[PDB]
Enzyme design. Sequence first.
Site, PDB file in Angstrom:
ATOM      1  N   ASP A  11      -4.658 -15.407  14.489  1.00  0.00           N
ATOM      2  CA  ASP A  11      -5.386 -16.529  15.072  1.00  0.00           C
ATOM      3  C   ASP A  11      -6.667 -16.890  14.261  1.00  0.00           C
ATOM      4  OD1 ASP A  11      -6.199 -18.555  16.983  1.00  0.00           O
ATOM      5  OD2 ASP A  11      -7.004 -17.013  18.350  1.00  0.00           O
ATOM      6  N   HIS A  17      -4.261 -24.217   8.040  1.00  0.00           N
ATOM      7  CA  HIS A  17      -2.882 -23.714   7.906  1.00  0.00           C
ATOM      8  C   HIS A  17      -2.514 -23.342   6.503  1.00  0.00           C
ATOM      9  CE1 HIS A  17      -2.303 -25.841  11.943  1.00  0.00           C
ATOM     10  NE2 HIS A  17      -2.805 -24.582  12.103  1.00  0.00           N
ATOM     11  N   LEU A  31      10.503  -3.379   3.337  1.00  0.00           N
ATOM     12  CA  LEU A  31       9.871  -4.042   4.578  1.00  0.00           C
ATOM     13  C   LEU A  31      10.829  -4.942   5.360  1.00  0.00           C
ATOM     14  CD1 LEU A  31       6.613  -4.323   5.603  1.00  0.00           C
ATOM     15  CD2 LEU A  31       6.663  -6.257   4.235  1.00  0.00           C
TER      16      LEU A  31
END
Lengths: 206, 208
Positions: free
Chosen positions: B13, B30, B108
Site C-alpha cells: 500500500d 503505480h 520462487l
Amino acid sequence: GCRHVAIIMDGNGRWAKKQGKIRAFGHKAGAKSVRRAVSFAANNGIEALTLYAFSALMELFVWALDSEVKSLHRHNVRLRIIGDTSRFNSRLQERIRKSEALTAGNTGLTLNIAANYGGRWDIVQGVRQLAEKLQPDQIDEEMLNQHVCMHELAPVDLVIRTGGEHRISNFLLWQIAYAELYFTDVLWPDFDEQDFEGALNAFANR
Amino acid sequence: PAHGCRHVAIIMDGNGRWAKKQGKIRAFGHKAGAKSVRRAVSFAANNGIEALTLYAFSSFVWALDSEVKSLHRHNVRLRIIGDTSRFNSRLQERIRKSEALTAGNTGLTLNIAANYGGRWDIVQGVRQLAEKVQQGQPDQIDEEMLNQHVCMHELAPVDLVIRTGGEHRISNFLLWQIAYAELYFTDVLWPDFDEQDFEGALNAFANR
Ligand SMILES: CCCCCCCCCCOc1cccc(C(=O)Nc2ccc([N+](=O)[O-])cc2C(=O)O)c1
Ligand SMILES: CCCCCCCCCCOc1cccc(C(=O)Nc2ccc([N+](=O)[O-])cc2C(=O)O)c1
Ligand SMILES: CCCCCCCCCCOc1cccc(C(=O)Nc2ccc([N+](=O)[O-])cc2C(=O)O)c1
C-alpha cells in the site's frame, strides 16, 4: 465509533517471571486486568468486548469467571462464551448455560470470553454445518458469515494484542478482515485504562 | 537461510500517497510501485524465500504481457490467486498460459493476487468440499482438510505479512493462511520500500 473490541491478553507469565513470582501470581494480576478492561469498555459505551486468554488451563479460567457472574449481571453485561466447550466437564457446561441464560437479556456490554476457541475451528464448525445440508453454488460470504461466531454482533473494529508479539495466533480470523490491529509491548497485567484509551485513539485517528 | 523465513506476503500500500506527496497523479505512483515490485521479487529470489505473495491495494495483470518472460527465465513458478473466472477470456487465457508456462518451475513461487479476498478464498475452498460431499462425509471435515482447499495449500505456511503505507489492517487479504504468521507494519510507502526495508522486515521475523 469503535463498537467492538477484541483483545489477545498475552503476557501474564512474562509478567510473573519479571516480578519474581510464580505463574499463578501473573494469572491473578491478569484477572484484575480483565475486570479493569471490562469496566472501562462498559463505561465507555463499547457494545462488545471479546477476550482471548492466551500466553487444560482453559477450564480453570472459565471457573474463575463463574464466581464473577453475579457482578457482571448487576452491571447489565451480557456474557457469552465462544469456543469449543463440548468436551468440558458437564457441570461447568451447565454453569456456562445458566450464566449465559441469566444475562442473555442484559442490555449493556456484550462480553464474549473465548474459551478453547480457534479462528480456524470457528470457521470449520460453520463449514461442518453448511455441509451437513442447499446447493454448493449458493454458499457465499454472507452465508458463511451466518454460521461463524458473533455474527449477530457489531463487526470487530479493533484487535488489541498485549505482551509484545505481532500475531493473531489463531484468534478471530474471519471476523478481523477489516479491523484495526493494535500491538503494544505492555504485558496483560499492566494494561490499564490509559493503554486501552491509547488503542481507541489509534482507531479514532484512522 | 539465517532469516529463517520461507513464505512472505506483502500488502503493497501507499502508491497513491507517494504520488500526491510529489505532486503527481496516481499513475506515477503505480509506475514507481511497479519498479518496487520488481525489486522485491528479485530480493526474495536471491535470499532463499520459497513463496512471495503480493497484494496490490491503495488506501494489473495486463502487462504480465511483458514481465512473465523474465519470471520464467529466473525459474519462478507464477501463480495468480483470486477470482479470475470473472475476467474476459483473453485475459483468463493470458493468465492460463503464463501459469501453464512456469508451472514446472522450481525456484520462487510468486503468487500475485487479482480480484482476491481472504473470505472469498475460504468461500471457494468450502465449495470444493461441498461438491465433494454431494458426490458422496461432513463429520470428517477438519482444519487440515479445508486447509487443503484454500489458496496456496501446497506452499510453505505464510511466515511473514508485510504491510507498507502505514495502515494496520489485513483489508481482507489472507485470513485463513495468516493464523500464525508474523505481522509487520511499516509507514514506508510501497514505492520507497527497498532491499534494506525488506531486510528490516526479515530481520524482524528472525530477531523475533
Ligand atoms: C479469569 C478472569 C476473572 C474474570 C473477572 C472478570 C469479571 C468482570 C468483573 C465485572 O465487574 C464489572 C463488570 C461489568 C461492568 C463493570 C463496571 O462497569 N464497573 C464499573 C462501572 C463504572 C465505574 N466507574 O468508574 O464509575 C467503575 C466500575 C467498576 O466496576 O470498576 C464491572
Ligand atoms: C512490474 C510488475 C507490475 C506488477 C503489477 C501487478 C499487480 C496487479 C494486480 C492485479 O489486481 C487486480 C486485477 C484485476 C481486478 C482486481 C480486483 O480487485 N477486481 C475487483 C473486481 C470486482 C469486484 N467486485 O466484487 O465488484 C472487486 C474487485 C476488487 O477486489 O476491488 C485486482
Ligand atoms: C502477472 C504479472 C506478474 C507481475 C510481474 C512481476 C515483475 C517481476 C519482475 C521480474 O524481475 C526479476 C525476477 C526475478 C529475479 C530478478 C532478478 O534476479 N533481477 C536481477 C538481479 C540481479 C541483477 N543484476 O544487476 O545482476 C539484475 C536483475 C534483473 O532482473 O534486472 C528479476
